[PDB]
Amino acid sequence: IRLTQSPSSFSASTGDRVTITCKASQSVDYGGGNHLRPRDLISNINVIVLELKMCEYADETATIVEFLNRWITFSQSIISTLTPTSSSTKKTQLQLEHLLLDLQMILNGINNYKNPKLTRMLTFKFYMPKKATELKHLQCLEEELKPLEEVLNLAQSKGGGGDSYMNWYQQKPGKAPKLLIYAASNLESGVPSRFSGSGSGTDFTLTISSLQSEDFATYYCQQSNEDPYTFGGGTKVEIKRTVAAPSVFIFPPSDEQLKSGTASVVCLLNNFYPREAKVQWKVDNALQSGNSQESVTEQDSKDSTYSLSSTLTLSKADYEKHKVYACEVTHQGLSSPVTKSFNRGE
Amino acid sequence: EVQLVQSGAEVKKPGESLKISCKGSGYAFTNYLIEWVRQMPGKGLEWMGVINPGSGGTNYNEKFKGQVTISADKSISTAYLQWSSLKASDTAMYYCARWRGEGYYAYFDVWGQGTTVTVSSASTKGPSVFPLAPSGTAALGCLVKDYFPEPVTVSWNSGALTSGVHTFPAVLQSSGLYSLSSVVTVPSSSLGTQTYICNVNHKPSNTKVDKKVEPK
């Protein structure tokens, strides 16, 4: 399942209302309608087993599907051979049918491709009987009922309303993601009430009623419906501020570096907003390509500005073939592209 | 009180093996599933696999099957992510996360702090530090070039000069080596009074350079 977030990035002011979206390639909803009640199902099986019956377990454990399947094969095996010839042999046949139906109903309840919990329910280990051919062997099933209820608690569903297997996370630079909202709409303990989520099927949304300083971060949507779990590409909430043109500075290579056979020429764009800026290197008015690298800072904590460095790298020889070194800067704050130059000979 | 603590940053070469760890505390480690998530620079998050600490039961994203092994040691509340032979494509930030799966829940409530894995054939190399000489506010700086691995620390006048400093993120050159610049804006007339020194430290190579930046 592919998750698409929109917009990928945007600038907002404090006190603003923010709505970010998540679009899934296929529905992340499961369940609803007509249930999985671990308490009731287990309590019913426990009663039947005590009416029918040290357990000899096998060395090899099994998954929940293999465990349930073995007890269904066991239940069907006795039924196949049991011939009712008395009131007691008819009552044990009826109880065997009640057990077979209860095991099949737990099995069909969890064993289907759609079930978002199946793979995680399958990591659990169940103990198998060494031999299961007589009614006494049901003691092996009884002992494994408590771990069975603990696994069924993962697929617990009471109610006709559907569930959305979709979560929202907040991530700040260098920090781990932090859960904000689970199952499309549930606010996580401690999360400010200004955060909310809604949606169903394929369309999900996250809202911040009045943006605060601590809310500028990247937000990720995440689906839990089908393996492998996937994340959206993220939405980065940037702080909006007034347009600021960069203070451009150029640095020639040091003599120390030139002496070693390399010339790094640095253009600095200082304290600008927005982030969008075009830097072009010109050597004797000829546009340079593929010998430059850029680096940009994150938004300033107080100023909300960016700074950028652009480095043109040349060999001492290529550097000494030319005189004028220029960096042409294009930015929204600038009416015309600003050029900063130097002549190789000071 | 619930926490997941991950092992430190790793710097490895292609074909090397690696095992990273995730230790739980403040809760019963055996009762909750532990999952591994990777994040690459620029790219988002990808799920890798899950361990059931109580059983040793695992499941992998088909994309990483055969490349990684997830394991756990119940007795020491620790989960592991292991590679037999690292690739350049394994360079990422790795998180371990606690899975909450009761009823309709299917979410990650507790996260490890992250472990960075850097896969490169480069060897430890200390930087060369060059001045960025200033020509009413002047800009001056230092070019910290051709070092491996990250990080480098850059300060000005032994950290006493902080106002107007910008130490740019490092860029990985095609050589396999990193490079960065640290710049500072100062009052124009201070250039003929104040001495400006950039202090560069690269712990892996034990490089400690104090580069005086003079007007020119």
Q: Are residues A49 and A137 in the same domain?
A: yes
Q: How far is CA A19 from the centre of its chain?
A: 19
Q: Are residues B9 and B85 in the same domain?
A: yes
Could you tell me if B40 and B53 are in contact, meaning their C-beta atoms sit under 8 angstroms apart?
no
- Total domains in chain B come to 2
Name the E strands within A116-225.
Answer: 163-164, 166-171, 178-182, 186-187, 195-200, 203-208, 218-223
Overall size of chain B counted in residues? 216
Q: Are residues A232 and A176 in the same domain?
A: yes
Tokens found for residue A121: 């329910």
Tokens found for residue B22: 């995730």
Whether residues A117 and B63 touch (CB distance < 8 A) is answered with: no
Whether residues A123 and B52 touch (CB distance < 8 A) is answered with: yes
CATH of the domain at A307: 2.60.40.10
Residue where a domain stops, chosen among B119, B148, B169: B119
Q: Are residues A264 and A303 in the same domain?
A: yes
Q: Are residues A25 and A92 in the same domain?
A: no
Q: Are residues A171 and A212 in the same domain?
A: yes
Could you tell me if A332 and B204 are in contact, meaning their C-beta atoms sit under 8 angstroms apart?
no
H or E segment and range at residue A279:
strand A277-283
Residue holding tokens 């480690």?
B29
> Could you tell me how many CB contacts below 8 A there are between chain A and chain B?
158
Could you tell me if A239 and B53 are in contact, meaning their C-beta atoms sit under 8 angstroms apart?
no
Q: Are residues B13 and B51 in the same domain?
A: yes
Q: How many CB atoms lie within 10 A of CB A37?
A: 14
Dihedral sign of CA atoms A277, A281, A284, A287 in order: negative
Q: Are residues A170 and A269 in the same domain?
A: no
Tokens found for residue B95: 């998180």
Q: Are residues A198 and A285 in the same domain?
A: no
User: What's the burial of A41, exposed, middle or buried (CB within 10 Å: 0-12/13-18/19+)?
Assistant: buried
Rounded-to-integer distance, Cα B40 and Cα B22, Å: 19
B133 interaction partners in chain A (CB closer than 8 Å): 251-252, 254
- Rg of chain B over Cα atoms, rounded to whole angstroms, equals 22
Contacting residues for A259 by C-beta, under 8 A, at least 6 apart: none
Q: Is A149 helix (H, G, I), strand (E, B) or coil?
A: helix
Q: How far is CA B32 from the centre of its chain?
A: 27
Residue where a domain stops, chosen among A135, A152, A169: A152
* C-alpha pair distances (Å), A192 with each of A187, B27, B68: 8, 25, 38
Q: Are residues B11 and B112 in the same domain?
A: yes
This PDB structure is determined at a resolution in Å of: 2.0
Helices within A53-203 (DSSP H only): 64-81, 87-110, 118-121, 139-143, 145-152
Is the preceding peptide bond at A228 cis, omega within 30 degrees of 0?
A: yes
Could you tell me if B180 and B168 are in contact, meaning their C-beta atoms sit under 8 angstroms apart?
yes
Q: How many CB atoms lie within 10 A of CB B181?
A: 25
- Total domains in chain A come to 3
Q: Are residues B11 and B46 in the same domain?
A: yes
Rounded-to-integer distance, Cα A40 and Cα A80, Å: 28
Rounded-to-integer distance, Cα A272 and Cα A250, Å: 16
Q: Are residues B146 and B189 in the same domain?
A: yes
Dihedral (C-alpha) A109, A112, A116, A118: value to the nearest 10 degrees?
A: 80
Tokens found for residue B33: 């599933």
Query: Which range of residues forms the domain containing residue A25?
Result: 3-31+161-239
Q: Are residues B93 and B110 in the same domain?
A: yes
User: Where on the phi/psi map is residue A344: left (φ > 0), alpha (ψ -120 to 50), or beta?
Assistant: alpha
Which contacts (CB < 8 Å, 24+ apart) does range A184-190 have? Answer: A188/B109
Residue where a domain stops, chosen among B69, B88, B119: B119
Q: Are residues A180 and A325 in the same domain?
A: no
Residue where a domain stops, chosen among B77, B94, B119: B119
Name the E strands within chain B.
Answer: 3-6, 10-12, 18-25, 33-39, 45-51, 58-60, 68-73, 78-83, 92-100, 107-111, 115-119, 128-132, 137-147, 153-156, 165-167, 171-172, 178-187, 196-202, 207-213
H or E segment and range at residue B16:
none
Q: What is the largest CA-CA distance in chain A?
A: 115
Phi and psi, residue B17, nearest 5°: -90, 160
CATH of the domain at B12: 2.60.40.10
B105 interaction partners in chain A (CB closer than 8 Å): 182-183
Instruction: Enumerate the β-bridge partners of residue A207.
Output: A19, A196
Residue where a domain stops, chosen among A196, A215, A239: A239
Residue holding tokens 């990035």?
A9
Q: How many CB atoms lie within 10 A of CB B71?
A: 14
Whether residues A176 and B133 touch (CB distance < 8 A) is answered with: no
Q: Are residues A43 and A78 in the same domain?
A: yes
Put simply, whether B1 touches A (Cβ < 8 Å) is: no
**Amino acid identity of B131?**
P
Running DSSP on this structure, what letter comes out for residue B91? -
Q: Are residues B73 and B168 in the same domain?
A: no
Query: Which range of residues forms the domain containing residue B147?
Result: 128-213
Put simply, whether B59 touches A (Cβ < 8 Å) is: yes
Q: Are residues A273 and A230 in the same domain?
A: no
End-to-end alpha carbon distance in chain B: 56
Put simply, whether B212 touches A (Cβ < 8 Å) is: no
Q: Are residues A61 and A109 in the same domain?
A: yes
Running DSSP on this structure, what letter comes out for residue B65? B
Q: How many CB atoms lie within 10 A of CB B150?
A: 16
Q: Which residue of A has its CA nearest to B145?
A: A264
A188 interaction partners in chain B (CB closer than 8 Å): 109
Q: Are residues B107 and B136 in the same domain?
A: no
Q: Are residues B148 and B105 in the same domain?
A: no
Q: What is the largest CA-CA distance in chain B?
A: 71
H or E segment and range at residue A315:
strand A306-315
Q: How many CB atoms lie within 10 A of CB B4?
A: 23
Rounded-to-integer distance, Cα A249 and Cα B12, Å: 38
| C-to-N gaps above 2.5 Å in chain A, after residues | 34, 53
